Ligand binder design. Structure first.
Ligand SMILES: [Br-]
Ligand SMILES: [Br-]
Ligand SMILES: [Br-]
Ligand SMILES: [Br-]
Ligand SMILES: [Br-]
Ligand SMILES: [Br-]
Ligand SMILES: [Br-]
Ligand SMILES: [Br-]
Ligand SMILES: [Br-]
Ligand SMILES: [Br-]
Lengths: 156, 156, 156, 156, 156, 156, 156, 156, 156, 156
């Protein structure tokens, strides 16, 4: 039977334990997700308290990280989602994504309405991924693709 | 000589005026940006107070919208950036992008550090585009590409 | 061509003007919506800056309220939605709905996940109505129906 | 003698404990509330710290969940209500109901005053229920019914 | 037909105009409410944007303060209530009432549950009054009386 | 020697302990305050962390509640007052008193100034009581008496 | 008849006007207060929107600053007090006084309770003043004296 | 070697331990400071986490209060200063000081500039004392002396 | 006689007028500060409302910018300082300086206490300059110098 | 394999532990950093939770401070950066740097755009140092140098 959380702290405390075990074992997120059938972004978000793992995946990652039974069960719960401590991120790496919204938020809205119409680009029927692409001018670029379904707003 | 702003309301007031003109003329953002040499996301962001237009572009769009001269000069000024009224958007269309950050923010962090290293994906050496495509399962999707240069943090 | 707003104050200012006009004419929202072929709750939300009217409806209600042309055009723009002045309502009528969330929010989460699964009940593919029902103990009840589509969150 | 709480964390810490027990026994909210004589939404809300159970219901659910006597006692206390961590929910599921308020709050006020008069629709003399309904176009809809007593505001 | 406001600033601006006239005419709130049939506290709350006056009171106070027709009409609208500028009062006189809540809020909760049971003391079915008394140790006391109906919360 | 507190959580934690003990003994606040020579609202506020008890009363309530010596000592300390978690109450019961201030705060200011003059109605030279009263219409009312000394602001 | 304000902005705007006129006339606060019979701190506070002037003083200072009739009347109104824009001052000169509270607020509480008892040092029956005193180690010192009446909190 | 703190909670927790020991020993702040060669406000502020004690003073108050070595060492650390829990005090005793800034903040700014010049009255080169004295009209007053060095801002 | 402001918007509105004038004349800040005898950062800060100009400098920059007499007078007033709209900048260019504080603020505190002692590095007895240098890896760097006097905190 | 944190409190608790060990051993940050090959500001920042140490450095500092293996591992993790407890520092030493931004932030923006162009001075490609320089008028000056790379914003 499906089970859900209401206090994000239970899963976020579990995330810190996971990250410690991960480091002690010198593991990567790619390796933790490999063999699971699930995308690296999905498995990683689950570890970090933002998604639920199916049971088989919870056991698979529990074994890799030496987690206890309560922990494997907790990973299967539907989380109380929200990873930002206090609305605005303090961390530079996360903050950049917030700043992209401060710069282009209204442009995303205007261009969505133009291309699709009234409504939203969904954050539920959605996936994201991060690809590394060499920069012609030197160094590396990240192309983050946000991929979401258009949900129209219509009169009733 | 480059000229900059310190109070966002001046450019945001101009954005409202530009939108009224645009609606009166029943123009699209794609049409406004056409012939400009610049990406629709870039030019649109300028209209909306978040970027500076080169004089040539400003003149072009200023013609299209019948702007007065103070308006065409204002569009060339470097803006006081920040399109969100009070930190967290209230508009559902803009909110979904904020929600991506609440669900995937710590995952983006974790995976940027894994794929690139310590540091950030930049929001200045950065490009944005929005594509409408059909969803294989039915209806329409947005593919939004956040294209940013990796900037490492290294000891000193 | 579709047109959108980015500053809520343009449509909220129009809303106050509409409200004065309406009062002077001693009209109801029921009567304003009459003949539009659109629900009272939809047309009302439009006048109040939270939905866009199609041109024909905009011209009908403009007629009823003696709106000028710029106003009628504005009513057709996709709004920058968000009707609450500063996140938490101060008005008792509005506040009671916020208190429903403070009391039942986690219960709505839990029971949604139990009945439907992981994901959300949407606010976009969504309809709302308000019905007055006699209370059998004496007085009147409001039955407010929130009718939203289930959007699953599945692994990928 | 009736007993009441003043710090929400006691009962929210209990709710976390309850949820772990529930997960361990693979129970549903529907099963927990069976035999109680009380609505699923009311019993769930009590488990989650937002309502008080009568003593018989408290003993029933305590038995189902293997709760100690202090926990069974606590469930009977009148709580310090407020389930949202920090005013605006982070969780998408909970957030959609907040967004309904940001889009429709003022329409709700408008239409309540039109249909009933000055005053409020109550959140205390109040019932709430969640029903799953097939969507004609495919998939599932939630019909959430808010049912509140009208309390008029009159001159004195 | 009943008319309602959604933006408090329309009535609060009217309030300021009312106060200026009141000052210019050297009137008291006592005098302004004379002849209306309505308590001082209720009429005052109206002038200040927190209650609606019946048509006949609106005309009476309007004539006293030399208000235009639009202002007299506005006073009859059901307000968007909330007098405090930004949640916590800065003014010492108002602040004392908020401090009473900071000292006695939990005590009021506890004693309300003890005496009446689960639920609330209402702010709708409610009145207040301010009375002056001599202090037997010198000077004067205000006895502010809050009189609200008990509304029970019961299981369903 | 008088002793005082600087972190409210010490006394608030004590209050939760008191409330568990009270509930276990099925005690009322009225019965706890009996024999102290002090008003119900005063003793209750002390238990809840918002007043100091004299030694004798501290010993007496501690006897009835089975409190340890450190706890009886804590009840005699002058508290760091402020019972509200985060400025605005979440709990419906407490919230209604905040809403009274949102609806009537400026009226209270206005009528205080008219009846008494410039200055404040004190919250320190102050007493509070809660009286349950038959409602002639059926049901019950709370008459909450706020009895405060007027403190004038005079030029200097 | 006493008259009071409810929106600080009316008197704060007037304060800006007064400061412009003062500057054009190259006047000091010392000379504006001279002749009124009122302390410089009181008269200054009044000009700045935080006290009311009696009629004769309002007329005197109005003559000195060439204020119009409505401005002279506004100065006699009991203000909606609160001079800080948004709770925490930005201005360094004002901020130092807030920092004194952040460093010594709890020490002030502790020592007031030790020296006087439970209760407060009042801010109504209160005067303050700023004296320049040569610093024996070179430079100048401000001695700011805060002088307030002790109001005891006693059991009832 | 000088040592310093970055998280206020270490020293604030230590403050609560100190206050319990002080209450248990029935000590005053006056007598704890006796023999340190240091002012009662300075030593008190140290105990409360807002200043650093020299080693000799730390040992002396340490022996009076029976503190362990880690505690005595912590007292010598340069603190992460800021005694207010969440910017605005809730405690009435501390609040009055904040209210003095809300009423007289801009007056203090204006008079400091007039009497001293452009700059600040510092909170670092600064001393504070609290005196109890009779009020000529009856009762008791506090004379709180804020004694700080004027620091000019000069052009560069 | 020295003159001061209490509402930042008077000088910020003047700043926006200055910047429109400066842009029409295609002036640089370096040119405007030329011949004033004052550092470009000092004069610029003054134009932007954060410092006061001496009378001769005010006249000079006012000649260059074609400012009227009231505007020239306003530049000589001691400002209500505070350039950040709402505590945390939204503009990326300004935000980066805030991020330096989020990353290095506690390091700064630690290294100041180690190198100088307990106290502060002043922001009043202070100068600032921005220098453009070549980046030896290619591109350009800013060397921004914060030059402030150490002010110790010593026991008393 | 790189390892990253998501909750700042893990590393901040570590910092408090480090600080106590450091105090006990009477060590300086200068000397902790010695032997490390990394700048005092960088190493100090790492100890305080704002930078990651390479493995050799982590072992070296870990041996000086008597840290356990888990702590030495945690120091190697990429941090969730943000040292300020709640956006605006309370500590006077840290606050001065915030105040510098309140006084000079718009000047920094203005001059950066003038000298370099549209874009930012970076806080990732960035170093800082603190130098003591005797004030020739007496005492000591801290010269804090901020050195960041210019990142242009260009059209695309
Ligand atoms: Br969605
Ligand atoms: Br960047
Ligand atoms: Br949705
Ligand atoms: Br209600
Ligand atoms: Br109510
Ligand atoms: Br008081
Ligand atoms: Br007071
Ligand atoms: Br200072
Ligand atoms: Br300073
Ligand atoms: Br950067």
């Amino acid at each position: 039977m499906i089970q859900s959380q209401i206090n994000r702290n239970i899963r976020l405390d579990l995330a810190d334990a996971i990250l410690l075990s991960k480091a002690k074992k010198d593991l990567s997120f790619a390796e933790i997700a490999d063999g699971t059938g699930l995308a690296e972004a999905f498995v990683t978000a689950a570890l970090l308290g933002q998604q639920a793992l199916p049971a088989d995946a919870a056991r698979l990652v529990g074994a890799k990280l030496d987690l206890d039974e309560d922990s494997i069960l907790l990973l299967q719960m539907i989380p109380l989602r929200g990873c930002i401590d206090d609305r605005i991120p303090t961390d530079p790496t996360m903050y950049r994504f917030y700043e992209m919204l401060q710069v282009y938020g209204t442009t995303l809205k205007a261009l969505v309405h133009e291309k699709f119409g009234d409504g939203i680009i969904g954050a539920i029927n959605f996936k994201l991924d991060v690809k590394k692409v060499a920069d012609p001018e030197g160094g590396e670029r990240a192309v983050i693709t946000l991929d979401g379904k258009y949900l129209p707003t219509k009169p009733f």
